[PDB]
Amino acid sequence: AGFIEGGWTGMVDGWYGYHHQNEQGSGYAADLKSTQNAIDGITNKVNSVIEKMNTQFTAVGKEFNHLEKRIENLNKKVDDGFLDIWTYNAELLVLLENERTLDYHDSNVKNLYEKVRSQLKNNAKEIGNGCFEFYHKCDNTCMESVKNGTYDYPKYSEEAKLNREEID
Amino acid sequence: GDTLCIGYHANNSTDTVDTLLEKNVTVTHSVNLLEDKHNGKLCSINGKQPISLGDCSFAGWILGNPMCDDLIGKTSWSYIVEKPNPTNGICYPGTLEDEEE
Amino acid sequence: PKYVKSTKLRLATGLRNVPS
């Protein structure tokens, strides 16, 4: 849903998460592991990008007399050139790093989706909007096992094949 | 049948940032790095006594221009304020060599 | 802080906001 479809305003405990819907109802739940890694990385990124800019001690301006006009224009050029250089660096890195930040978030979405997919290959059928419909019943315990990386595929493989082969 | 879905977060934030591929990208969370509020507050820095020469040029203050006696005894500062157009400078016409040094 | 010529330097910490 990075651009596939929309986000979730009801999920307010993390960047990324799941929306589960079973017999016991529905609800949002953030994935703390991937959200935590993303916070770690974006924090280190912002701090590195900002803190990398340290400059030497400078009393900037200079005024040169009527016999030092060449001396003068050179100093104004140096001042304004350091201006241009630091401005150029800040602008480019802000643009590039906002790009890379959005793309990093997209890749985190993709990785979470692929994890949930690899856990449930034939026990669930993919719904095209980043969803899965179970051929079996995934109770709260099953949902949590999917969420903390410990889904049991042989546990439900029997019921899922039965319901799958009948559905199809 | 049951469904288990995956998605990311949304809020009511309208913070827009620019990327090279796309401008005015509304993000959920951002940080402004640019302070752009010269506040009416213009004061000293470390509670010092920043001294204004008033209508005296730097040369007029250093040489001792007679109309610049409001500056005598002004001993310490965090910086010095000079108008672009003071009235009392080098009164007898002349120059202070290396004025700028 | 550093003087620059930019008029806006807010950096994205989060991902795009897409309601609904």
Epitope: G10, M11, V12, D13, W15, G27, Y28, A29, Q36 | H29 | -
Partner: antibody, heavy 121, light 108 residues
């Protein structure tokens, strides 16, 4: 402001069900997580757990088997219910609001005033 | 899961003295701690989150430093009103765990 007040009968009998109600003013509960935390007098603080109206609760393991958290959006409250309160369960209870996502992770800024629950015959 | 050693239990230091409270952790937690000031018989007041994010309105004398498993709450100038019990919470993994708390008193 968001303000969290706390009501607890106190003096729950040693094999009964504690029922605690945190009342919420200045915030629609349906769009916030709600947390319960506890303190055995001079002892440290303990996180009881988390609950949401459109979400999934998570509780502390030591109390997991016994805790149930509910939310009344009608009366703007949320309640703990702890089965078979032990002598060790006598402590001060606090209710807090789980703020939304921040760049420094999730914050609990807003805190209840604390009510004493004593377990005695 | 995450046991907490917050040293030392009891401190007394005169006004203006710097104070440092160490909050050792059982596992890796990155920098995800909180520091709370619980005044006597009152709700705990969150001093620091992110271990380095001074909550708005908190006096700038408070500073949180660390990442990983070791962390330190440092009061630059101890003041009378800073008499309380100081806890360190962890929000990297449930269950959230507090330290035993450190009682800061004042030599006078």
């Amino acid at each position: 402001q968001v303000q969290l007040q706390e009501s607890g009968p106190g003096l729950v009998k040693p094999s009964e069900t504690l029922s605690l109600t945190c009342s919420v003013s200045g915030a629609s509960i349906s769009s916030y997580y709600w947390i319960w935390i506890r303190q055995p007098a001079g002892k440290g603080l303990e996180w009881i757990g988390r609950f949401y109206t459109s979400g999934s609760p998570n509780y502390n393991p030591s109390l997991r088997s016994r805790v149930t958290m509910s939310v009344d959006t009608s009366k703007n409250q949320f309640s703990l219910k702890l089965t078979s309160v032990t002598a060790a369960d006598t402590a001060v209870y606090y209710c807090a609001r789980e703020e939304h996502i921040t760049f420094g992770g999730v914050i609990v800024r807003y805190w209840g005033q604390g009510t004493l629950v004593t377990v005695s015959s | 899961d995450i046991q907490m050693t917050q040293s030392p239990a009891t401190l007394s230091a005169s006004v203006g003295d710097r104070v440092s409270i160490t909050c050792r952790a059982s596992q890796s937690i990155s920098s995800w701690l909180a520091w709370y000031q619980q005044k006597p018989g009152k709700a705990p007041k969150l001093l620091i989150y992110k271990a380095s994010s001074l909550e708005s309105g908190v006096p700038s004398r408070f500073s949180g430093s660390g990442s990983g498993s070791e962390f330190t709450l440092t009061i630059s100038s101890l003041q009378p009103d800073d008499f309380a019990i100081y806890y360190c919470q962890q929000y990297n993994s449930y269950p959230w765990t507090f330290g035993q708390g450190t009682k800061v008193e004042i030599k006078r």
